[PDB]
Amino acid sequence: LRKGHQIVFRALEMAQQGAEAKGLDKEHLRVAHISCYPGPTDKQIDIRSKGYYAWK
Amino acid sequence: PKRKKNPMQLRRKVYGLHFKEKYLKMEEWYYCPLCAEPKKPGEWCRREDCRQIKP
Amino acid sequence: GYTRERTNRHFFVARANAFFSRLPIARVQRSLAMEAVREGRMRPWKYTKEQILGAPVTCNFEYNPRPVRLIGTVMDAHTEETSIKGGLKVYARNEETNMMLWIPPGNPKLRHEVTSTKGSFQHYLDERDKWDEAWITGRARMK
Amino acid sequence: SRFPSQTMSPCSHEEEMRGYVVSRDYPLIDRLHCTRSIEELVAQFEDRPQIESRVAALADMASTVSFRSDEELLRMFTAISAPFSVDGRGLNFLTVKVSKFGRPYYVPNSLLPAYVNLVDATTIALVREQPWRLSASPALFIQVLQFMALIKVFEPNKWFTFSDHAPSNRADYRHAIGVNHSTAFWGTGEELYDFMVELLRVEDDGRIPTMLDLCTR
Amino acid sequence: ARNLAPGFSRGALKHDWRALGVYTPDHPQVPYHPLQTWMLG
């Protein structure tokens, strides 16, 4: 029940499709190296009730 | 009095049981004998077969 | 320095609500009530709340030298059948003195007898209004 | 001349519950004693290797260790000493790894208390109530000695340690706050070893070796 | 008693207790039958 788990499920699905396309078997597949490094960033300001600015 | 915390104080939380049991923990699952899907024991499917008999 | 308030000891945490079925507890209650009846501390009663509500009652509290007698009107009966629980709500007025008692059955030094199982709801309402007026007057004179 | 209070439903011969017997005074003491054969116990131990079967057979032979013979005792010890090795830890059966505190500690299964109760019953049977069986039969002496050497009894810390790099102190440590109460300071084989060393020193006071004359080189 | 497994300790197939010396005067027990390989895994 975690957004990271859903995203890595999508990634696993795509990687399995790619491995099948390359010619690797399905039953003998195993994750060998999974990592994440910081990427892009956006800055969003928004007004709240009774006029207060908040940064995110 | 608040100050920046060294990396060691940032890694003390993973030593406690609250962090381990919340984020990093596996599931006990098996295959739904009627749906052929991974299923935890106790929660069932919407299908008519899975409601009458519990797979 | 440090202490512990909860105990996860097995002998303390285990319960027997599942095994309470093999104990005839209601039969034990009825047996206690019947023992009280046969000893004479109480007398069996079978009336409903609306039937007994509003019936005159006389209660004698045994006391050397003179047992104190009190004639009142039953205001509320807590039980319809005899049991160890029981409970009766009587209201009695002496000369310029009102009182509302809760008589429990089974007291050997207390013999209460309702003069008739039948009751008059009109007299019940009269006694209730008298008691409420007395209570309101007392509270108003206090505050 | 009595008649039962109800009908007994029929049952097959294999599905009966024989092998045990209630004590003499049943209406006061309903203790259950086993009368199974040591060959049956060994066959169960060797065919059904599940931990529950193991502890059941061990309890049965620990209750039957009183009135058995030397040959049956040797057979039992030889059948028990099978899953043990000298290189590894003697009587370790760690199954649960509880990391509630900072570093984890290991809790074993019922096989360890089963073996401890068996050793205690053997001690009570060969020391207190029958102090002559060891001096009479030197083979049983050597057999129980080699079994007590195969299972590391004099170092119960190796029962609870899981990795040799961090030895355990579950048995030698105890604090009055309430930690390690049932598991610390277990007198498992101390009395038996003392009785055996005393039997071996009996020679110096008796001037003639009974045990050493009965045994072989 | 769907969840309740006869003879097993708390409905666990790997903790068989039937046909052993578990003295139980009032409650019944089930004779032993060797479990299959697909039942345990």
Next chain:
Amino acid sequence: DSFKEHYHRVHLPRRLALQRYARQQSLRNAAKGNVKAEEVPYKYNRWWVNEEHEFVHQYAFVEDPEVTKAKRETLPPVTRENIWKEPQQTFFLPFAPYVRVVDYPKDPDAKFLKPVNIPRWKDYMQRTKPVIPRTWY
């Protein structure tokens, strides 16, 4: 780890080893083929008179291993009917009740005519323990 805590943590196995060494001397006897329980000398000097001239009784109790084994194996006899039927007394009656009334003296107010067998108020108040000879209640 406090000083006393460390001391006890390092000495308790040594205490157990010392007790084992002590019991090894007892096991020496059973090893030679003559199993003999430990004998303790019964002390007859346990009833004393203190400095303030009052009685003191020491209590020395011994444990018999054979009797322990017998109580472990053989069941106790049948409990007595009167023992299990007659309930235990709630209030402890005084050692000497002060009756304050005796029918023997003709004039009851005559203090010199009351019989001596009736206990006095001083005994009624001070006698809360058994007499010098009798130790148990």
Next chain:
Amino acid sequence: PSLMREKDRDMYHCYYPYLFDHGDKMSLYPKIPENPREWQPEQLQTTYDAIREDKYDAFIRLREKFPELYQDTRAWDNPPPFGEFNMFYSVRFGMVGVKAFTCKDYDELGNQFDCTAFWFPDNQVVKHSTRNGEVGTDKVYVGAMNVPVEFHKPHVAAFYKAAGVPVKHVCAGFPITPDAYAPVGTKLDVRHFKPGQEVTITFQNTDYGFRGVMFRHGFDGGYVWLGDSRWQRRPGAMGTEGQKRIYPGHRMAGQTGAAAETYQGVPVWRIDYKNSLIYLPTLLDADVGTYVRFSDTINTKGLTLWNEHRGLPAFPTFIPPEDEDLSKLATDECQLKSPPLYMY
């Protein structure tokens, strides 16, 4: 009690003829040194003293001639053998009960007692345990509430298998003296207790969860303060200590209930030995179904519980007669009520 220094244990303070050890046979004189050189220059080796001889002889003569006059002096020799119940040494194990329900009773004087009834389903002596065989370090575990095999955990069903006793739900240990043993598997009838008996009970009160500091300590929680600092009683100088930290034991908000609560010295009200029920006039805090443990009160008001004046216990444990059948016996026949008592 009366202070008695060990140095006051000379023969001039003994109430009976002081007997010296003197090897195997007790004597009336100190052991004369076998080596004559060990004789101290002022030590008067006594072999025969007519004073002590006459006193001891007259004492023995009177004891052997007038047993009725010198009955109390017989405790000097032939002491009570071990195994019999003793008034100051014999403690027996209690039982394990289940809080059944509550009711109200009345005594003959007219006092009302809100009583609670506990139920003792199946009390059976399960185990004996002593640590390394020391003195007074032995105890008896009693089990209760027989259950099927599929109920308990595997590691506790394994112990019940190893013991051979029928598998019980709960098991509580009572520390006793060795002369109060009972063989493994002994059924404990509720008549083990007496109606006029003081009992100490231990249970677990109900759980309220995390509660406020007001609800925990009542009015006490609002004001919590303690200062061990020195303060000047008279304006002569200046000096004090600052209460830096908060002293341990500060009353705050936390877990409430769900603890081991023990009542000490509650009298039994009535006993029903057909349904195995005991009534206590004290309202408890625990829920219904909490496995309480009952044990015998040692002594109250400097007076032992078990004595000839109050009554003798069912030592070691009550065993019913053979021809008694609780099935044939009715419920009203199985009622034992305590003698009256007033508390106001």
Next chain:
Amino acid sequence: SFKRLPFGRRSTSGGVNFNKGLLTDRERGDPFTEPHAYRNKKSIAAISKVAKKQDILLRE
């Protein structure tokens, strides 16, 4: 139930505390005789039900 564990109550019997000796609702029967039930001027339910009940009893 580990985050809530230190705060919420925990029980093995499932929260069953039922005393068959205390007075239950069916044994009490009717609460209208209680003073609050017939003087609760703040509950339309209490007022209407007690009025209906007194009128029915007087009529009977």
Next chain:
Amino acid sequence: APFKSVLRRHKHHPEGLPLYNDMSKQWLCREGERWWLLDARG
């Protein structure tokens, strides 16, 4: 850089405190160990 773990043994911890007579650390030698007797009378 040397590092001592914060997750150390404790007296309340079930693992308990060790015996240096039974330990097998690097800085603990046991070969050259002699036994002396010391009477403390007086």
Next chain:
Amino acid sequence: KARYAGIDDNPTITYKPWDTTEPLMADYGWTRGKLPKFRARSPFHRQQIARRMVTEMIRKDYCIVGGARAPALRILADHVVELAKAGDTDSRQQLAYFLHDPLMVDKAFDEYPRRFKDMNAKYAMMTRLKSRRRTDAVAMYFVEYKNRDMSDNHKGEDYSAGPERFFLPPRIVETEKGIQR
């Protein structure tokens, strides 16, 4: 502490089965003697939610609800089936008071007696679905009446998947396509 619902109006010759409850008003709480209170904005809001929920349950024979709403809905459906088995005029007046749709009141009182003539208690059935709601990560429960195919206006209908449109009648198993509503 005291429930004014105990004050009985128009008492019958025979005492009611419950004799202390409404039984529709459940007095939601957290002790085991009461029903699990699903989080709402007020007790009135909770009663309104329960009313709409049981109305829709009676209407469409099934309801998928999240959180503690499932046990409350199941117990309320049980009480509704008890009212239908009673079949008294006062019971029908009470159910029409409590429900939003008198047409659904009539549907229930027409179909439920024949449906649950041969049952004692536990008429509804709750099944915890493994799929949780996305916005709240809360477990979902499918609550439906048991006796669907023996006697009811719904019969031989498929609940494994919804229809083509939400305004079309539900799927029907090919075995019982001939029945008419």
Next chain:
Amino acid sequence: SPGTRRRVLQEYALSPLFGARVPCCVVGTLRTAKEIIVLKRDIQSLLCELMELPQGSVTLGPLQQLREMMLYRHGTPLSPRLGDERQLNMDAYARRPIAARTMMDVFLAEDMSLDEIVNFGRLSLGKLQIALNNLRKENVEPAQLLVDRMGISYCEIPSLDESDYVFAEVGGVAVTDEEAERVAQRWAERCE
């Protein structure tokens, strides 16, 4: 009057137990009560043929269904009866599985005495035991018919109901034997 109230209470207390009857042999089967409903009538005929009594003497009481329990408990009277008993197999570490879930009590004529009742109960118990043994050994007689076609697999001889109690003291006044005999004679006259 309190005197006459205590008198009528003592009368109803010493009154004979009406509507009470002791059963001969309580029968039990594994099938459900809803199934035994349709066959309960033939049970009377088969039991009459088994007891060799004239047709119409056996009376079956209300059919009971022992409440199924996930956690078995023996002391409850609603417990499903077990195929084994402690007196039957003392040396067995457990009991045999459940044998009966639907029960019914059997009564003879009211004039028959307790010795005849217990003799017929013992005879029925022995015959049903032999019938069950023959059933087990195999896979005409009334016992075999009851065992095969009716699915009956349990018989019990219930103990005498001792829950009754004599009134030694009613309303705080002891009951004299003369008063007890008077009340008994009054009730006998009323019954006559």
Next chain:
Amino acid sequence: IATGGRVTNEDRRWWLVHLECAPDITPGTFIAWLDCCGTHTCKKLIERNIWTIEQVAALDSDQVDELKYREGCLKMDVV
């Protein structure tokens, strides 16, 4: 009464001694006076045309079995 399972001689004596408390109870009263007589328990007796204690006592074993198991009356045996 909460007997459960089987009616006992204790419950018999309870009913006998409570019969005194009601002086107006006649053998022709409505069936609702009996204990454990709920709405669903008494409506089935009304269907079978049982309006009297005499009739409900004359009820047969097979009939009370039908009332308990096929009709759905729980405490009909106790009644």
Next chain:
RNA sequence: AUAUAUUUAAUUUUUAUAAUUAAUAAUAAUUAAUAUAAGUACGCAAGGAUUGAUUAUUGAAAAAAGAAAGAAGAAUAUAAUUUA
């Protein structure tokens, strides 16, 4: 009239099983008045004893080993009250 560190109150979820070891004297300085103790010694008289038991607060004191993503309720206090 600012979210902090030390220190405290708790918790780390059935552990079959308390504490021979940290609470290093004592939960009151092992009490303790009280009717009855006493219309009694002592006092011309008036008046006025020492005193400790049943009536009270007096048990003084810490329950640390087993496989963990539902509500520790299948929830209307029954371990399924019959159930198609």
Next chain:
RNA sequence: UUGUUAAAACAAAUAAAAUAAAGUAUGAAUUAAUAUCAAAAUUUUAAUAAAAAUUAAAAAA
């Protein structure tokens, strides 16, 4: 509980019951010299000394 009026009403204010105000995702800002920061007691040095010394031993979330 207090106060006012009259021969019960009004206003204040808190302490018990009851109601709500998530265990889901989204996610800032005050602050920041720092050793995986020095649990405590004693003594002392130029003003809180968290600066030094002596006892003692202070687990993790």
